[PDB]
Symmetry: C4
Subunit: 342 residues, 4 copies
């Protein structure tokens, strides 16, 4: 009577199993794919959010081997200009977002004319007739444009996007840090299972999966890749960097920047699907990426994964309980110094 | 040796799976049934509680497409008068509660004479000889009166109520926010399983199930409907509105109203089965309903549920762990603004 | 490789399922057995602890239909005198504790001479050669003395005690509120499973099981009985009453009494297996018993259990998750008044 | 699609089952093995950490029947001198650590010349070509030197170490109190399962398993042994003792010592895998060992384990839920005095 499809898992439900290794962290190969036609030197892309990615962060991230997605909460002229600013900064790639609603044809044309490398239809509605037909329309108009459609969280959603013509499948319905879709609507799929379910289909086509949302610690990047993702999209992890939009706010001896959902009231201007918040100031993006990729390298040394494909297709998990996750964190000790990756 | 019937689930144990959709939130159809003979434009009814539903809230709720149940903690004359006040307010429907104990015949007669649309026998003892024979007596005296009996939490309880002649089955033993039945007695069934178990029987008869208690967020409304309920009954979600009984209380810069169980000592005047509390002031009921139904509409857009029946009979769940629920909430960020639906 | 016998449950893992009922709380029959030869009017006995049971509480409890166990942390003459004081208070029954170590023969003789109704060998070592041979020695010396041996937590422990000649089996290794055996030693069995496992054996002999430790709320009493216990032993629930030993301590506007484990350093005067604490002052034992038995009566009304035997042998459980237990408690509301049973 | 090998358990997921006993705590035999050739009078060894083990603690621990591992964060001359200082203190055994990287030949030679009893290659990379070939090189150079290699967390890791020539297998990837490997990398195995998996292989060879990390309470020592370990390695439990390195720090009326991971930035001088912290001051190591071994003795009395081998090979577990662990701790009472083992 209760129509329950299966028990789905998230990052804190699993750990990666150490295995025979010939890999040292400094020899690990971090290269991967965003699409069949767009390679990345590291498996990180930035969220299309108004508190994460404008040209400044997109440039810095691309210089580190990732790609940024310029957010849609600005005029067409402004967004095209940001794309152009990244493109003229010496051989760098950039993406840009547009919404799922009809009437974005002019915006897409302007972004393409500005040299955008990949268009994102930025939505939770990947498995909808509207988004699928938007993808088909876009693929007709731009036969050689790399396209990522709305997010999905299932095998059938991934298949539908692929059949519509996307270049990569992005996975995540409500796992975001600043996000309340799952609470407001009741809808979502724990992210590890969501990634694996999508990958089971996408792998058949050689189409990359992008794991979007819920990444808190560098270890979550490893887990997302092992679940089947070719790369991760992050908001919180990059929010609060110097390069992210917004000024640094001093409060009670500590520094912060604003970070908000794109379905928050502030971002939309209504029934919101995110909140408005503040996040500790992180310093420069370069050091954050170094910390995060250091964790992933150390993972690859422990799992014996020479490349991201090895991690993505060969590494094994164990299922854990809540006590297992409490043991994984610091426990039974007072932390006197905050570590740069914790 | 341990007589354990099965593992039962509640709202936070499950999420709804996104599916193919042709539904936009503004095209979703929220109409449903309270009984075979009483339709609702939205799937919400208010609790028969002395801190939730008197005529003022019953009127406002009926104007929004729901129905209120006037509580029993007042004299017969007062309760009939409240019913009458809702009935003369332009085409509005109303319910009213009576207790399970013998001797309520005069009260029932007065409520019927005042034009009550549906009588509720307001109790946790739906599966008891007393309540079942009270239903039979009432159905004999008023062959055309819509009747809802005591609450149940099982398939057999639902069957018994149906065989006694009820017009809808209401489900919930102790899930309420302000309620302690399960702690004081040890008795209850997690609400998602309770709803599904009742619905498995009630569906055979075309008899609506009402999911009563434990609804905290709009996403819980979606889940209750998908578990099999035609509509939800809420106390906490409407307590604290301007229209609910009681005055607004200012304390340390914030406003509150009283909210208490009907088995609390205060409400009964003894071994209580609820507590007395205060709840943040919510403003006008209209905006709360708009927020809550906005969440449900957004659910229906994501699940592809065109109607409440589609959600109730076709949408699928996934089982989740505690980590999955922590990911669903806001996490790893400081909330600087409270959202109207969170 | 990991020798794991099975997954064991405690009170918060389960709820009782409501069933057809002809029972009202005021008609429920609370009578039960402590042993085949000692009946109780209510299913409650007090812990043999120096912060719970001396003559004053033993008298008050016996007047309410239970039995107290006078603790062993006093001289032989003092303990015999306390027994005598309960016996001369008009037809009342009393128990008394002795430790498991050799050399307690004189103490046992003095307690028997004072008229003790039941002797408890007060220990966690029920399944030990020493305790079993102590029981055999005692049964030889006093062929008609009701005897309860050391605690057990397994079927085989219960069988061994029965074969040694006990009159009741007491179950509980480390579930106590003030107790640390499970943390210090790593040994124990979650109490619901422990009770059921013991009862599976004891039921074959018609020998009562006493559920000792871990009872926090009245609903836990219901659950212990449904798991197979004929009655419960409580420390925390009665500590802090006016009748318990110790003076009332005022601190920051609230009143307390001391409550400590019998393996705490304070009680022993070493490697302790309990702690020293304070518990809120509860008032008179009579009102506490009324609240606790009111909860049990309300359970019996909901489960349709006319007698304690019906609850003990017929009522069904459902297994629940942590979300199910959070729903059972008060949730999402501020408690402005503390209820007498919560 | 999700490559999940099995559900793995940690200390708080399990309890030991009481069994028939002829063992009293004072008759329990605590003797065990560190290697086939090195016996221990108690099953405790100290972590090779710069805030746990230098000569002073190594001497005190060896006098109590354990063995200390002098940490590697000092010059060769200094480390050899510390070894020598323990060796000349009247018949005492000592170990010493070296890192996994090439170029430690001189350090090993100096430690051997100073009389070290056992060499530890102190690493998380036990299952790596580098560590395995380091073990082989060392075994070639010192055919009669007791060697422990890098840590492992799997059956295959244990087999590989054994085939390379180790004298004991040490188990633990990231369970440490002050440690963040699992969070930073995503890699690890809950410690109870890790120990059992290693032991399943090591038992075939008669090779001891050492359970390293995650031990918080004395009951965890019992559980590690029952999972298959011959002895435990502890950092937190001994940090903060008078004999551990570092001065006592007074802060707000309480005393502390520093305790930090060996992958913390402070210890390494970078992407750290531990943190820097402070731990409450514990007093002299002798009393801590007495408390911890008192807990283990009490376990052995309850499980009927006459020897450590009996506990290690015969004692049974039950799986528990989070409610079972909450019952095991102190609950529902205010602790007015801190117990020496809690
Ligand atoms: N990945 C997620 O779980 C998630 C969820 C909500 C919001 N968001 C973020 O917020 C922004 C808005 O995302 P969104 O579009 O999912 O939020 P949304 O559900 O508010 O939809 C936004 C617009 O798209 C159209 N739309 C609404 N429901 C639709 C449906 N069921 N099918 C097709 N089209 C529909 C409407 O025109 C609407 O104004 C984006 O920047 C996105 O990244 C993400
Ligand atoms: N849905 C729930 O889980 C729940 C539980 C307790 C109270 N309540 C609320 O509190 C109020 C009282 O509800 P209640 O009647 O369940 O509380 P209750 O158990 O206190 O019963 C109230 C009255 O009904 C009769 N009654 C008591 N036990 C009975 C039984 N086992 N069978 C038949 N009749 C019995 C008695 O005359 C009693 O005074 C109502 O407004 C109700 O909504 C709800
Ligand atoms: N039910 C429990 O889980 C539990 C646990 C510890 C203490 N206690 C309470 O504390 C008091 C002491 O109880 P306890 O005796 O279990 O604590 P314990 O384990 O400290 O034993 C106390 C005495 O009994 C003897 N003893 C010790 N270990 C034994 C063994 N393995 N087999 C046989 N005899 C042994 C010794 O002489 C010892 O001094 C009692 O009042 C009891 O209620 C209860
Ligand atoms: N048991 C654990 O889970 C754990 C984890 C991290 C650190 N530590 C502690 O911190 C210290 C450093 O331990 P570590 O060496 O595991 O930390 P690590 O991963 O930082 O490695 C330290 C050095 O060993 C070499 N190394 C790095 N990765 C390697 C790999 N994949 N295979 C082979 N060699 C590699 C490098 O030269 C590196 O500088 C030790 O004292 C150790 O006890 C323990
Ligand atoms: O449910 C949502 N409501 C929102 O308001 C919202 N805004 C962003 N997003 C999504 O969250 C991702 C960022 O997540 P993290 O901060 O966890 O990296 C992003 O990359 C998006 O997928 C939203 N999701
Ligand atoms: O166990 C109970 N003790 C009480 O004192 C009590 N009062 C109300 N109710 C029930 O709780 C429902 C309201 O629940 P929410 O606040 O969660 O919406 C209501 O609609 C009722 O079903 C009670 N349940
Ligand atoms: O592990 C233990 N260490 C102790 O120091 C201790 N003292 C009492 N007891 C046992 O706890 C029971 C009382 O438990 P409650 O307070 O939960 O009712 C009692 O009835 C005893 O079974 C102890 N258990
Ligand atoms: O992940 C790690 N990062 C670190 O920085 C670190 N330093 C020590 N160790 C390991 O932790 C063990 C001590 O653990 P406890 O404090 O829990 O006894 C030790 O015995 C080591 O196995 C580390 N692990
Ligand atoms: K850890
Ligand atoms: K979220
Ligand atoms: K509740
Ligand atoms: K306990």
């Amino acid at each position: 009577m209760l129509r329950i499809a299966k028990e789905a898992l998230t990052f804190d439900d699993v750990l990666l199993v150490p295995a025979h290794s010939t890999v040292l962290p400094n020899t690990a190969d971090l290269r991967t794919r965003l699409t069949k036609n767009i390679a990345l030197n590291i498996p990180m892309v930035s969220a299309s959010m108004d508190t994460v990615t404008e040209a400044r962060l997109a440039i810095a991230l691309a210089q580190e081997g990732g790609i940024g997605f310029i957010h849609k909460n600005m005029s067409i002229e402004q967004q095209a200009a940001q794309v152009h600013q990244v493109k003229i900064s010496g051989g760098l790639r950039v993406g840009a977002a547009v919404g799922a609603a009809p009437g974005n044809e002019e915006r897409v044309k302007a972004l393409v004319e500005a040299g955008v490398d990949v268009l994102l239809i930025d939505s939770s509605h990947g498995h909808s007739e509207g988004v699928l037909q938007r993808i088909r329309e876009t693929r007709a108009a731009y036969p050689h444009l790399e396209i990522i459609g709305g997010n999905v969280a299932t095998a059938e959603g991934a298949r539908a996007l692929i059949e519509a013509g996307v270049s990569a499948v992005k996975v995540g319905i409500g796992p975001g840090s600043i996000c309340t879709t799952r609470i407001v609507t009741g809808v979502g799929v724990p992210q590890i299972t969501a990634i694996a379910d999508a990958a089971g289909v996408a792998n058949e086509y050689g189409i990359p999966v992008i794991a979007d949302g819920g990444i808190r610690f560098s270890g979550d990047i490893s887990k997302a890749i092992a679940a089947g993702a070719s790369c991760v999209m992050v908001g919180s992890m990059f929010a609060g960097t110097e390069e992210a939009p917004g000024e640094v706010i001093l409060y009670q001896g500590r520094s912060y920047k604003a970070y908000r959902g794109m379905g928050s009231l502030g971002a939309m201007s209504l029934v919101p699907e995110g909140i408005e918040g503040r996040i500790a100031y992180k310093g420069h993006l370069k050091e954050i990426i170094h910390q995060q990729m250091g964790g992933l390298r150390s993972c690859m040394g422990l799992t014996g994964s020479a490349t991201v494909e090895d991690l993505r297709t060969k590494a094994q998990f164990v299922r854990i309980s809540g006590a297992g996750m409490k043991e994984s964190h610091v426990h039974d000790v007072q932390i006197t110094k905050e570590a740069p990756n914790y």
